[PDB]
Amino acid sequence: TVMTQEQFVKRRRDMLEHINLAMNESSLALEFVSLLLSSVKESTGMSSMSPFLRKVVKPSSLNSDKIPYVAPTKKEYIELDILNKGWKLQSLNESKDLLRASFNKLSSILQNEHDYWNKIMQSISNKDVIFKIRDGQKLLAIKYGYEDS
Amino acid sequence: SNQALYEKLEQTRTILSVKLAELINMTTIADAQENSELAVATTSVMMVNNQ
Amino acid sequence: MFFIKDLSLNITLHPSFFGPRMKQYLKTKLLEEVEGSCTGKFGYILCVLDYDNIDIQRGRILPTDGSAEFNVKYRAVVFKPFKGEVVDGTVVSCSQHGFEVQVGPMKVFVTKHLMPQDLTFNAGSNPPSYQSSEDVITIKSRIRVKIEGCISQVSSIHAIGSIKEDYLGAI
Amino acid sequence: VTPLDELQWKSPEWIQVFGLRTENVLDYFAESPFFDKTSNNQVIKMQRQFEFAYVDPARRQILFKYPMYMQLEEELMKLDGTEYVLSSVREPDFWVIRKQRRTNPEIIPLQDYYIIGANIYQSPTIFKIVQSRLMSTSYHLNSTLESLYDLIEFQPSQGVHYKVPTTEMLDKLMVTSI
Amino acid sequence: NLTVSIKIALMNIPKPLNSYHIKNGRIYFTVPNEFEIQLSTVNRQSPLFFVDLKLLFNTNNLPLNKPRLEKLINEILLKSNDPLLSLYNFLHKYVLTLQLYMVHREFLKLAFSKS
Amino acid sequence: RRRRLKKVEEEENAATLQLGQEFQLKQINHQGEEEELIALNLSEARLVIKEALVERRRAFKRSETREKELESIDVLLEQTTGGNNKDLKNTMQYLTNFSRFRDQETVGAVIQLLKSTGLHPFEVAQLGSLACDTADEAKTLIPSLNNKISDDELERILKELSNLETL
Amino acid sequence: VSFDFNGVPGQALDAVRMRLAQLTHSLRRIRDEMSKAELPQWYTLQSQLNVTLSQLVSVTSTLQHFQETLDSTVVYPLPKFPTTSHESLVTTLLRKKNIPEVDEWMKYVRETSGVTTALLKDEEIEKLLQQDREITNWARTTFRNEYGKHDFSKPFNVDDVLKFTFTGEKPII
């Protein structure tokens, strides 16, 4: 396939907005936990609160209590289990497709590399001299000058 | 240089030997332990992104 | 233990380094005369902090030697042991007199009088080691030791260790 | 199906007809799906149609301020089992009502329900809150990872890197002319 | 156009800069076969601002440090007592510095021998 | 300034908090003002030294697992500094072996957790350095902690230090 | 009054706050390093992504270790919370609903599991999961036995020769 600038920049923008959403959700969870921790600690929750949350609400604004210890039922055991089975199957399918695509692309690249090395060994004699050179990419440079002869 | 090639080859060989087996081994169910849809989600995404 | 302290050193510059980059020569001689240098007053000085802004004032020419004396003030991380302090380390040598444990840049030698009596020397092992009923102490072994004695010369520091206290020894 | 811990409930027909104040939060809450029909509150409501320990000072203030809730507590001490009691009030509009089991008095609490502007919410578990937030975080992170790996090209001649999409003398002029 | 023409009437003009072309939202101060620099003003009481410049001597259209030269030309227009004489002196010295470096480049690329 | 000989003084001992007259709690800095004595734990010292070395590498240019960490800091060491680095190499190896915490956020969590105690810098650096487990073991490892921290507070703070221990 | 803050878990909430702050700070690193027009070096970016993923695993494992006393504590606002003025804020901070994207994708994987509750009995589901875990056990012992099948100078003295060269005496052997 061939990749273009506009497709590149829309992928850039959508992964930027996805990482923004991930950061937002993680920070919302962190600030909920810190606002609940300030009910009993009052110091370390204030460190993890937002300045905006400190402006809006005061610490010790939430309270929680112990509802009784309950054992989850077998219906939601098997529901969580069948969810786990299906989602592990979906991850297995994604891994299969990723491995297949990587194998195809790497096979194309290695056929190109094998052709390149076969061309090198059918092209270059041991009398010729080769050295590595940068631009930062590695390139082979052959020296044909008479200055050493 | 060749000692570094030894160490890198050996480490990569061991982790290739263990890694796919771990990838499929963590696809198990037990009442290791996943009592939450969050645990299921995290283990499933760490399969693809870690193994 | 590791500390951060304000340090001052009188450094001598030969007149051959009286160039436009005399400050750079001063900083380089500060590096290869302070980094890794041992002093008994301020401990093993490891690395110089804040290399971008090192306080170098005017340097006095010595009236007879002709060299310049700069009183350079700097920030550095040091390592000074103290009596009665518990540190971790690894064994690098063993003998019948005792064994040395490597903490930081310093070797603390633990004498043969300062192990529990069940632990005995075994020189037949290769490398020679110390063996007891429950654990073995050899080269490249993690071990926690208390320093109960420190001697500090002008340029050398040597410490004495012991593991006879409970909840010490190998980790 | 929508689980009960995840919905906001109000009855604006009840708000237009009766109106919500502190004196009618419990029978306003009785119309909610949060309310259990087999509760001691409802059965003593049917019966009536037909200092003290065991409570925190937050509920002491509510009882000593509102007399009908002391009447409710005095009638609930005669029975044992599930009940709803009003724990914290901010006038004019904030309430907290807790599920509560009582034995003869030994009291253990259960799930709570907070009332903000006659809009009733069931108190979720903090596990459920942070777990939903981390589900969202994991989904967005996985999408970020997949979309970033779509931008990865591998070459053997270099390291693995990003796919490539498909005048020097003017300062010398400036310094010479000025 | 009326604003740049109502502004240039109150200012003295350099003798080689008497060729000015008055169209298209700006003024074209030109020196023939040397350069043509175009400037605009916003109002009566504000000093003129750089718009563009075209090089008229044969090499052309060599690329230049456009934002840097715009910044310094606007700066000297703002601070100079006589903006037109200052601009003419600076630009004449700049194009002749360009010409000296160009003949230097030809002389160094000519290296016949250096003996 | 008085010119007494003052040759009599107590021996520097860690249990009595006597670290010498120039490792006192207050230190006059190069700017002239007094400052709290900066005592580092092992992971904190490793991160400060690594930060100094990468800053020096940046200045020279302008002018995680154990195996990759050791070679990375070895290349950093040989790139940054010149001669007489046996001692500094041993410090780097010792800190990367016995570094309890990996990154800056975890170690700064350790400093703020130990500054919530309001305790001695030497004592909190010893707590952050030694991989202790129980309160009584902490008291017998550091005799300086006797009659300073309650047992429940000690066991809980070492409990979240054990939680913060990683890899 | 005191409101009796007690049913509030201290150590579990503190631990999840510390891991969650680590995860949030790593996500902030990824945001302000990756939003720029030029991407960072891919080795550094992959290392940051791996640290972020490992911290997500760590906070999930800490929350799993505190699975109880986290389902067993329900949270309500207090009166000193401004509820009339910031009802949206308190409901956003106390929401347990996760996004329609993740719910539609969990429904998708539930449908593509190939088996559902809607047309099978609970005993049939339990025996299907039992034979499923038996198949996984067979696969992992196959991995175990397959992995166990394979294994996983001086010819002379320069000083002596030069001392001969300058004096004439033979090198000592």
Side-chain angles (χ1 to χ4, degrees), chain A residues 20-33, chain D residues 130 133-134 136-138, chain G residues 19-28 56 59:
Chain A
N20 286 330
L21 291 171
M23 182 187 78
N24 207 14
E25 294 299 287
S26 172
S27 48
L28 279 173
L30 169 64
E31 292 191 9
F32 157 69
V33 175
Chain D
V130 302
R133 290 303 190 182
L134 285 170
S136 299
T137 300
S138 166
Chain G
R19 283 85 170 93
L20 198 43
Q22 284 172 32
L23 175 60
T24 315
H25 182 74
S26 298
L27 283 175
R28 186 153 29 81
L56 182 53
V59 73

PDB file of all heavy atoms in Angstrom, chain A residues 20-33, chain D residues 130 133-134 136-138, chain G residues 19-28 56 59:
ATOM      1  N   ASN A  20      -6.188  12.025  24.375  1.00  0.00           N
ATOM      2  CA  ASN A  20      -6.822  13.055  25.196  1.00  0.00           C
ATOM      3  C   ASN A  20      -7.965  12.478  26.019  1.00  0.00           C
ATOM      4  O   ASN A  20      -8.094  12.776  27.211  1.00  0.00           O
ATOM      5  CB  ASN A  20      -7.337  14.193  24.316  1.00  0.00           C
ATOM      6  CG  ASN A  20      -6.228  15.076  23.789  1.00  0.00           C
ATOM      7  OD1 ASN A  20      -5.195  15.241  24.431  1.00  0.00           O
ATOM      8  ND2 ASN A  20      -6.439  15.651  22.611  1.00  0.00           N
ATOM      9  N   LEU A  21      -8.799  11.640  25.397  1.00  0.00           N
ATOM     10  CA  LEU A  21      -9.911  11.026  26.115  1.00  0.00           C
ATOM     11  C   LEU A  21      -9.421  10.062  27.191  1.00  0.00           C
ATOM     12  O   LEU A  21      -9.995  10.010  28.287  1.00  0.00           O
ATOM     13  CB  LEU A  21     -10.839  10.318  25.130  1.00  0.00           C
ATOM     14  CG  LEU A  21     -11.638  11.232  24.200  1.00  0.00           C
ATOM     15  CD1 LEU A  21     -12.339  10.426  23.121  1.00  0.00           C
ATOM     16  CD2 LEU A  21     -12.637  12.062  24.991  1.00  0.00           C
ATOM     17  N   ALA A  22      -8.362   9.299  26.899  1.00  0.00           N
ATOM     18  CA  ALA A  22      -7.793   8.395  27.898  1.00  0.00           C
ATOM     19  C   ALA A  22      -7.243   9.160  29.095  1.00  0.00           C
ATOM     20  O   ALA A  22      -7.485   8.779  30.250  1.00  0.00           O
ATOM     21  CB  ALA A  22      -6.695   7.539  27.270  1.00  0.00           C
ATOM     22  N   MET A  23      -6.511  10.249  28.835  1.00  0.00           N
ATOM     23  CA  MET A  23      -6.003  11.086  29.917  1.00  0.00           C
ATOM     24  C   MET A  23      -7.141  11.697  30.725  1.00  0.00           C
ATOM     25  O   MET A  23      -7.068  11.761  31.957  1.00  0.00           O
ATOM     26  CB  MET A  23      -5.117  12.193  29.355  1.00  0.00           C
ATOM     27  CG  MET A  23      -4.507  13.073  30.423  1.00  0.00           C
ATOM     28  SD  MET A  23      -3.642  14.466  29.702  1.00  0.00           S
ATOM     29  CE  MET A  23      -5.068  15.475  29.317  1.00  0.00           C
ATOM     30  N   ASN A  24      -8.197  12.151  30.041  1.00  0.00           N
ATOM     31  CA  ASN A  24      -9.336  12.756  30.725  1.00  0.00           C
ATOM     32  C   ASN A  24     -10.033  11.761  31.644  1.00  0.00           C
ATOM     33  O   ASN A  24     -10.363  12.090  32.789  1.00  0.00           O
ATOM     34  CB  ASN A  24     -10.320  13.312  29.699  1.00  0.00           C
ATOM     35  CG  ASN A  24     -11.129  14.470  30.235  1.00  0.00           C
ATOM     36  OD1 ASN A  24     -10.804  15.041  31.275  1.00  0.00           O
ATOM     37  ND2 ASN A  24     -12.195  14.820  29.530  1.00  0.00           N
ATOM     38  N   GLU A  25     -10.245  10.532  31.166  1.00  0.00           N
ATOM     39  CA  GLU A  25     -10.914   9.527  31.985  1.00  0.00           C
ATOM     40  C   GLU A  25     -10.049   9.102  33.168  1.00  0.00           C
ATOM     41  O   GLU A  25     -10.554   8.951  34.292  1.00  0.00           O
ATOM     42  CB  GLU A  25     -11.287   8.323  31.124  1.00  0.00           C
ATOM     43  CG  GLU A  25     -12.343   8.638  30.078  1.00  0.00           C
ATOM     44  CD  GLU A  25     -13.646   9.114  30.684  1.00  0.00           C
ATOM     45  OE1 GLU A  25     -14.373   8.283  31.267  1.00  0.00           O
ATOM     46  OE2 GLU A  25     -13.945  10.323  30.580  1.00  0.00           O
ATOM     47  N   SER A  26      -8.741   8.929  32.940  1.00  0.00           N
ATOM     48  CA  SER A  26      -7.841   8.569  34.032  1.00  0.00           C
ATOM     49  C   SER A  26      -7.762   9.677  35.076  1.00  0.00           C
ATOM     50  O   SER A  26      -7.738   9.401  36.283  1.00  0.00           O
ATOM     51  CB  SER A  26      -6.454   8.248  33.482  1.00  0.00           C
ATOM     52  OG  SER A  26      -5.517   8.073  34.531  1.00  0.00           O
ATOM     53  N   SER A  27      -7.744  10.938  34.635  1.00  0.00           N
ATOM     54  CA  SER A  27      -7.699  12.051  35.575  1.00  0.00           C
ATOM     55  C   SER A  27      -9.005  12.182  36.346  1.00  0.00           C
ATOM     56  O   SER A  27      -8.989  12.513  37.535  1.00  0.00           O
ATOM     57  CB  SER A  27      -7.377  13.352  34.845  1.00  0.00           C
ATOM     58  OG  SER A  27      -8.180  13.499  33.691  1.00  0.00           O
ATOM     59  N   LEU A  28     -10.143  11.932  35.691  1.00  0.00           N
ATOM     60  CA  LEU A  28     -11.422  11.961  36.396  1.00  0.00           C
ATOM     61  C   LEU A  28     -11.482  10.885  37.474  1.00  0.00           C
ATOM     62  O   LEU A  28     -11.949  11.141  38.593  1.00  0.00           O
ATOM     63  CB  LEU A  28     -12.574  11.798  35.407  1.00  0.00           C
ATOM     64  CG  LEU A  28     -12.998  13.061  34.657  1.00  0.00           C
ATOM     65  CD1 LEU A  28     -14.028  12.733  33.590  1.00  0.00           C
ATOM     66  CD2 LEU A  28     -13.539  14.099  35.625  1.00  0.00           C
ATOM     67  N   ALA A  29     -10.990   9.681  37.161  1.00  0.00           N
ATOM     68  CA  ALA A  29     -10.919   8.625  38.168  1.00  0.00           C
ATOM     69  C   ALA A  29      -9.990   9.007  39.314  1.00  0.00           C
ATOM     70  O   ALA A  29     -10.333   8.816  40.490  1.00  0.00           O
ATOM     71  CB  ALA A  29     -10.452   7.322  37.527  1.00  0.00           C
ATOM     72  N   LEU A  30      -8.817   9.562  38.986  1.00  0.00           N
ATOM     73  CA  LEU A  30      -7.852   9.969  40.002  1.00  0.00           C
ATOM     74  C   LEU A  30      -8.427  11.033  40.924  1.00  0.00           C
ATOM     75  O   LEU A  30      -8.231  10.982  42.143  1.00  0.00           O
ATOM     76  CB  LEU A  30      -6.580  10.488  39.330  1.00  0.00           C
ATOM     77  CG  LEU A  30      -5.564  11.188  40.234  1.00  0.00           C
ATOM     78  CD1 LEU A  30      -5.004  10.229  41.268  1.00  0.00           C
ATOM     79  CD2 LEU A  30      -4.455  11.828  39.415  1.00  0.00           C
ATOM     80  N   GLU A  31      -9.158  11.990  40.363  1.00  0.00           N
ATOM     81  CA  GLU A  31      -9.693  13.075  41.169  1.00  0.00           C
ATOM     82  C   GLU A  31     -10.893  12.642  41.991  1.00  0.00           C
ATOM     83  O   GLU A  31     -11.081  13.150  43.100  1.00  0.00           O
ATOM     84  CB  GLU A  31     -10.032  14.247  40.262  1.00  0.00           C
ATOM     85  CG  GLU A  31      -8.769  14.825  39.702  1.00  0.00           C
ATOM     86  CD  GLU A  31      -8.965  16.130  39.015  1.00  0.00           C
ATOM     87  OE1 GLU A  31     -10.067  16.711  39.101  1.00  0.00           O
ATOM     88  OE2 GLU A  31      -7.999  16.556  38.361  1.00  0.00           O
ATOM     89  N   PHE A  32     -11.690  11.693  41.489  1.00  0.00           N
ATOM     90  CA  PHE A  32     -12.711  11.078  42.330  1.00  0.00           C
ATOM     91  C   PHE A  32     -12.081  10.372  43.527  1.00  0.00           C
ATOM     92  O   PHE A  32     -12.534  10.533  44.670  1.00  0.00           O
ATOM     93  CB  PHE A  32     -13.544  10.099  41.505  1.00  0.00           C
ATOM     94  CG  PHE A  32     -14.226   9.051  42.328  1.00  0.00           C
ATOM     95  CD1 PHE A  32     -15.271   9.383  43.173  1.00  0.00           C
ATOM     96  CD2 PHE A  32     -13.805   7.733  42.270  1.00  0.00           C
ATOM     97  CE1 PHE A  32     -15.883   8.419  43.940  1.00  0.00           C
ATOM     98  CE2 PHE A  32     -14.418   6.767  43.032  1.00  0.00           C
ATOM     99  CZ  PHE A  32     -15.458   7.112  43.865  1.00  0.00           C
ATOM    100  N   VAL A  33     -11.014   9.603  43.282  1.00  0.00           N
ATOM    101  CA  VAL A  33     -10.356   8.875  44.364  1.00  0.00           C
ATOM    102  C   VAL A  33      -9.720   9.842  45.359  1.00  0.00           C
ATOM    103  O   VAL A  33      -9.786   9.632  46.574  1.00  0.00           O
ATOM    104  CB  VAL A  33      -9.330   7.881  43.789  1.00  0.00           C
ATOM    105  CG1 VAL A  33      -8.569   7.206  44.893  1.00  0.00           C
ATOM    106  CG2 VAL A  33     -10.028   6.824  42.984  1.00  0.00           C
TER     107      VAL A  33
ATOM    108  N   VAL D 130     -14.420   3.684  39.430  1.00  0.00           N
ATOM    109  CA  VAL D 130     -13.061   3.683  38.899  1.00  0.00           C
ATOM    110  C   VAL D 130     -12.890   2.607  37.840  1.00  0.00           C
ATOM    111  O   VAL D 130     -12.072   2.762  36.929  1.00  0.00           O
ATOM    112  CB  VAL D 130     -12.014   3.524  40.019  1.00  0.00           C
ATOM    113  CG1 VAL D 130     -12.164   4.635  41.030  1.00  0.00           C
ATOM    114  CG2 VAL D 130     -12.088   2.159  40.683  1.00  0.00           C
ATOM    115  N   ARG D 133     -14.257   4.069  34.594  1.00  0.00           N
ATOM    116  CA  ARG D 133     -13.276   5.037  34.110  1.00  0.00           C
ATOM    117  C   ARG D 133     -12.058   4.344  33.507  1.00  0.00           C
ATOM    118  O   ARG D 133     -11.528   4.782  32.480  1.00  0.00           O
ATOM    119  CB  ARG D 133     -12.852   5.962  35.244  1.00  0.00           C
ATOM    120  CG  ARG D 133     -13.913   6.937  35.721  1.00  0.00           C
ATOM    121  CD  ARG D 133     -14.427   7.805  34.589  1.00  0.00           C
ATOM    122  NE  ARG D 133     -15.267   8.887  35.085  1.00  0.00           N
ATOM    123  CZ  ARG D 133     -15.886   9.771  34.314  1.00  0.00           C
ATOM    124  NH1 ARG D 133     -15.799   9.719  32.996  1.00  0.00           N
ATOM    125  NH2 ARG D 133     -16.607  10.733  34.881  1.00  0.00           N
ATOM    126  N   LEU D 134     -11.616   3.242  34.116  1.00  0.00           N
ATOM    127  CA  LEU D 134     -10.472   2.516  33.580  1.00  0.00           C
ATOM    128  C   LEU D 134     -10.828   1.684  32.349  1.00  0.00           C
ATOM    129  O   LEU D 134      -9.954   1.448  31.513  1.00  0.00           O
ATOM    130  CB  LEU D 134      -9.853   1.645  34.673  1.00  0.00           C
ATOM    131  CG  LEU D 134      -9.032   2.428  35.701  1.00  0.00           C
ATOM    132  CD1 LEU D 134      -8.653   1.560  36.889  1.00  0.00           C
ATOM    133  CD2 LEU D 134      -7.791   3.021  35.052  1.00  0.00           C
ATOM    134  N   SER D 136     -12.888   2.943  30.082  1.00  0.00           N
ATOM    135  CA  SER D 136     -12.777   3.999  29.079  1.00  0.00           C
ATOM    136  C   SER D 136     -11.315   4.310  28.766  1.00  0.00           C
ATOM    137  O   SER D 136     -10.942   4.475  27.596  1.00  0.00           O
ATOM    138  CB  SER D 136     -13.506   5.251  29.559  1.00  0.00           C
ATOM    139  OG  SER D 136     -14.883   4.994  29.766  1.00  0.00           O
ATOM    140  N   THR D 137     -10.475   4.362  29.804  1.00  0.00           N
ATOM    141  CA  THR D 137      -9.048   4.615  29.623  1.00  0.00           C
ATOM    142  C   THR D 137      -8.393   3.520  28.790  1.00  0.00           C
ATOM    143  O   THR D 137      -7.616   3.806  27.872  1.00  0.00           O
ATOM    144  CB  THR D 137      -8.367   4.730  30.989  1.00  0.00           C
ATOM    145  OG1 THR D 137      -8.950   5.811  31.725  1.00  0.00           O
ATOM    146  CG2 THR D 137      -6.875   4.983  30.833  1.00  0.00           C
ATOM    147  N   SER D 138      -8.715   2.257  29.082  1.00  0.00           N
ATOM    148  CA  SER D 138      -8.128   1.138  28.357  1.00  0.00           C
ATOM    149  C   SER D 138      -8.596   1.100  26.908  1.00  0.00           C
ATOM    150  O   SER D 138      -7.802   0.806  26.010  1.00  0.00           O
ATOM    151  CB  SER D 138      -8.459  -0.175  29.064  1.00  0.00           C
ATOM    152  OG  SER D 138      -8.186  -1.287  28.230  1.00  0.00           O
TER     153      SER D 138
ATOM    154  N   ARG G  19      -1.277   4.602  42.202  1.00  0.00           N
ATOM    155  CA  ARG G  19      -1.148   3.989  40.874  1.00  0.00           C
ATOM    156  C   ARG G  19      -1.903   4.778  39.805  1.00  0.00           C
ATOM    157  O   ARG G  19      -1.432   4.906  38.665  1.00  0.00           O
ATOM    158  CB  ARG G  19      -1.611   2.528  40.871  1.00  0.00           C
ATOM    159  CG  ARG G  19      -0.652   1.489  41.467  1.00  0.00           C
ATOM    160  CD  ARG G  19      -0.730   1.311  42.960  1.00  0.00           C
ATOM    161  NE  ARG G  19       0.039   0.154  43.400  1.00  0.00           N
ATOM    162  CZ  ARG G  19       1.299   0.209  43.806  1.00  0.00           C
ATOM    163  NH1 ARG G  19       1.965   1.350  43.830  1.00  0.00           N
ATOM    164  NH2 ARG G  19       1.907  -0.909  44.194  1.00  0.00           N
ATOM    165  N   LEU G  20      -3.062   5.334  40.155  1.00  0.00           N
ATOM    166  CA  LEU G  20      -3.859   6.071  39.186  1.00  0.00           C
ATOM    167  C   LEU G  20      -3.216   7.406  38.833  1.00  0.00           C
ATOM    168  O   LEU G  20      -3.299   7.850  37.684  1.00  0.00           O
ATOM    169  CB  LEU G  20      -5.263   6.252  39.757  1.00  0.00           C
ATOM    170  CG  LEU G  20      -6.443   6.603  38.867  1.00  0.00           C
ATOM    171  CD1 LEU G  20      -6.413   5.783  37.599  1.00  0.00           C
ATOM    172  CD2 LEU G  20      -7.680   6.275  39.666  1.00  0.00           C
ATOM    173  N   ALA G  21      -2.550   8.042  39.802  1.00  0.00           N
ATOM    174  CA  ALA G  21      -1.782   9.250  39.527  1.00  0.00           C
ATOM    175  C   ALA G  21      -0.585   8.950  38.638  1.00  0.00           C
ATOM    176  O   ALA G  21      -0.246   9.753  37.762  1.00  0.00           O
ATOM    177  CB  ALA G  21      -1.330   9.894  40.836  1.00  0.00           C
ATOM    178  N   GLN G  22       0.069   7.802  38.856  1.00  0.00           N
ATOM    179  CA  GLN G  22       1.160   7.392  37.972  1.00  0.00           C
ATOM    180  C   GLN G  22       0.669   7.205  36.539  1.00  0.00           C
ATOM    181  O   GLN G  22       1.297   7.685  35.581  1.00  0.00           O
ATOM    182  CB  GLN G  22       1.791   6.100  38.493  1.00  0.00           C
ATOM    183  CG  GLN G  22       2.696   6.280  39.697  1.00  0.00           C
ATOM    184  CD  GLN G  22       3.134   4.956  40.292  1.00  0.00           C
ATOM    185  OE1 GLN G  22       3.286   3.965  39.581  1.00  0.00           O
ATOM    186  NE2 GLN G  22       3.331   4.932  41.605  1.00  0.00           N
ATOM    187  N   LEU G  23      -0.473   6.526  36.380  1.00  0.00           N
ATOM    188  CA  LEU G  23      -1.055   6.321  35.055  1.00  0.00           C
ATOM    189  C   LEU G  23      -1.449   7.644  34.401  1.00  0.00           C
ATOM    190  O   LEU G  23      -1.202   7.852  33.206  1.00  0.00           O
ATOM    191  CB  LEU G  23      -2.267   5.393  35.156  1.00  0.00           C
ATOM    192  CG  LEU G  23      -3.076   5.150  33.880  1.00  0.00           C
ATOM    193  CD1 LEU G  23      -2.213   4.525  32.798  1.00  0.00           C
ATOM    194  CD2 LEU G  23      -4.288   4.282  34.169  1.00  0.00           C
ATOM    195  N   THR G  24      -2.051   8.551  35.177  1.00  0.00           N
ATOM    196  CA  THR G  24      -2.461   9.846  34.641  1.00  0.00           C
ATOM    197  C   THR G  24      -1.262  10.683  34.218  1.00  0.00           C
ATOM    198  O   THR G  24      -1.304  11.364  33.187  1.00  0.00           O
ATOM    199  CB  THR G  24      -3.294  10.603  35.674  1.00  0.00           C
ATOM    200  OG1 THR G  24      -4.252   9.718  36.266  1.00  0.00           O
ATOM    201  CG2 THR G  24      -4.019  11.763  35.018  1.00  0.00           C
ATOM    202  N   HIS G  25      -0.181  10.650  35.001  1.00  0.00           N
ATOM    203  CA  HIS G  25       1.003  11.425  34.648  1.00  0.00           C
ATOM    204  C   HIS G  25       1.684  10.862  33.405  1.00  0.00           C
ATOM    205  O   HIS G  25       2.183  11.624  32.567  1.00  0.00           O
ATOM    206  CB  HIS G  25       1.971  11.474  35.827  1.00  0.00           C
ATOM    207  CG  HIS G  25       3.197  12.290  35.563  1.00  0.00           C
ATOM    208  ND1 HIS G  25       3.180  13.668  35.525  1.00  0.00           N
ATOM    209  CD2 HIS G  25       4.476  11.924  35.321  1.00  0.00           C
ATOM    210  CE1 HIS G  25       4.396  14.114  35.271  1.00  0.00           C
ATOM    211  NE2 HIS G  25       5.202  13.076  35.144  1.00  0.00           N
ATOM    212  N   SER G  26       1.711   9.532  33.262  1.00  0.00           N
ATOM    213  CA  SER G  26       2.252   8.941  32.038  1.00  0.00           C
ATOM    214  C   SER G  26       1.402   9.291  30.822  1.00  0.00           C
ATOM    215  O   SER G  26       1.936   9.569  29.737  1.00  0.00           O
ATOM    216  CB  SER G  26       2.368   7.429  32.192  1.00  0.00           C
ATOM    217  OG  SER G  26       3.264   7.090  33.235  1.00  0.00           O
ATOM    218  N   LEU G  27       0.075   9.283  30.981  1.00  0.00           N
ATOM    219  CA  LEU G  27      -0.802   9.692  29.891  1.00  0.00           C
ATOM    220  C   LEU G  27      -0.615  11.165  29.543  1.00  0.00           C
ATOM    221  O   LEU G  27      -0.692  11.537  28.366  1.00  0.00           O
ATOM    222  CB  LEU G  27      -2.257   9.404  30.257  1.00  0.00           C
ATOM    223  CG  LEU G  27      -2.678   7.935  30.148  1.00  0.00           C
ATOM    224  CD1 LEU G  27      -4.097   7.739  30.648  1.00  0.00           C
ATOM    225  CD2 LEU G  27      -2.538   7.441  28.723  1.00  0.00           C
ATOM    226  N   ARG G  28      -0.351  12.010  30.545  1.00  0.00           N
ATOM    227  CA  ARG G  28      -0.042  13.412  30.274  1.00  0.00           C
ATOM    228  C   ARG G  28       1.275  13.554  29.521  1.00  0.00           C
ATOM    229  O   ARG G  28       1.396  14.419  28.641  1.00  0.00           O
ATOM    230  CB  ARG G  28       0.007  14.215  31.573  1.00  0.00           C
ATOM    231  CG  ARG G  28       0.184  15.715  31.338  1.00  0.00           C
ATOM    232  CD  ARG G  28      -0.390  16.579  32.450  1.00  0.00           C
ATOM    233  NE  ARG G  28      -0.384  15.930  33.756  1.00  0.00           N
ATOM    234  CZ  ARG G  28       0.669  15.852  34.558  1.00  0.00           C
ATOM    235  NH1 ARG G  28       1.838  16.371  34.220  1.00  0.00           N
ATOM    236  NH2 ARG G  28       0.542  15.245  35.734  1.00  0.00           N
ATOM    237  N   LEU G  56      -1.212   0.685  33.940  1.00  0.00           N
ATOM    238  CA  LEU G  56      -2.610   0.270  33.844  1.00  0.00           C
ATOM    239  C   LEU G  56      -2.808  -1.128  34.424  1.00  0.00           C
ATOM    240  O   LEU G  56      -3.779  -1.378  35.151  1.00  0.00           O
ATOM    241  CB  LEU G  56      -3.075   0.323  32.390  1.00  0.00           C
ATOM    242  CG  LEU G  56      -4.537  -0.030  32.111  1.00  0.00           C
ATOM    243  CD1 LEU G  56      -5.471   0.805  32.972  1.00  0.00           C
ATOM    244  CD2 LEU G  56      -4.858   0.153  30.637  1.00  0.00           C
ATOM    245  N   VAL G  59      -2.527  -0.752  38.319  1.00  0.00           N
ATOM    246  CA  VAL G  59      -3.718  -0.218  38.974  1.00  0.00           C
ATOM    247  C   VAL G  59      -4.873  -1.214  38.886  1.00  0.00           C
ATOM    248  O   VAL G  59      -5.658  -1.342  39.836  1.00  0.00           O
ATOM    249  CB  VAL G  59      -4.080   1.181  38.421  1.00  0.00           C
ATOM    250  CG1 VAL G  59      -4.676   1.132  37.021  1.00  0.00           C
ATOM    251  CG2 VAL G  59      -5.025   1.897  39.376  1.00  0.00           C
TER     252      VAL G  59
END
